[PDB]
Design a protein around this ligand. Structure first.
Ligand SMILES: [Cl-]
Lengths: 133, 133
């Protein structure tokens, strides 16, 4: 059987959330507390996403839908609150898997073009000749 | 046959990149210009991602892979430059479709637990009782 956690081990859980989460007993105690006050949805969602990262790839589509059904869908039994930006991204990912793969890259490239490609075009002889016409 | 773009139309492309892009003759001219100076990869990538967002969903995985191959894979013929953050997110999405569906939400929730769930656990009787006894 497991040995009683030492004083130092228990104290170390109060040094930061990562400390508590990496210790399996610390993590158990953190969750048990939150359940006792009906406030565990956030940690349970975090743990469900951690589990998602380890699953075999062919399982991902069904597991993604399970997490959405449990935590984020309409009427979800463990509903969590997100900021609008992160909610929006998530819904698009769940409902349109793969479609938004390049979303952050595309926003980066759009911003660059506004500062480089497009201003060069407006300055070009090609554009001036179309103005004339 | 098409008529020559009026002076008013050509002028309009100068009120913002969005104006140039939504006019299909403006888009054509912008691209033609960038190709003449060998700097069109950024717009070509942008246009490929716009196209992706219109494709049927069953076609999205193969199309995602085709965009990765043309602009982003090793030795891509139309290689683009991204910032590290964008490139990391993109690679994960391409190589592990679906797995990072909840990335931004999980980060939101992780940071929230640092300010809410975690402190509540440490100040609880449950934790403080352990420490004492
Ligand atoms: Cl409290």
């Amino acid at each position: 059987s497991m040995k009683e956690p030492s004083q130092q081990r228990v104290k170390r859980w109060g040094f930061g959330m990562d400390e508590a989460l990496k210790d399996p007993v610390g993590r158990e105690q953190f969750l048990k507390f939150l359940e006792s006050e009906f406030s565990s949805e956030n940690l349970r969602f975090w743990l469900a996403v951690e589990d998602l990262k380890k699953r075999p790839i062919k399982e991902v589509p069904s597991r993604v839908q399970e997490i959405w059904q449990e935590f984020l869908a309409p009427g979800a039994p463990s509903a969590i609150n997100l900021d609008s930006k992160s909610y929006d991204k998530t819904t698009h990912n769940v409902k349109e898997p793969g479609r938004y793969t390049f979303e952050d890259a595309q926003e980066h490239i759009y911003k660059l073009m506004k500062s480089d490609s497009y201003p060069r075009f407006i300055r070009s002889s090609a554009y001036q000749e179309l103005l004339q016409a």
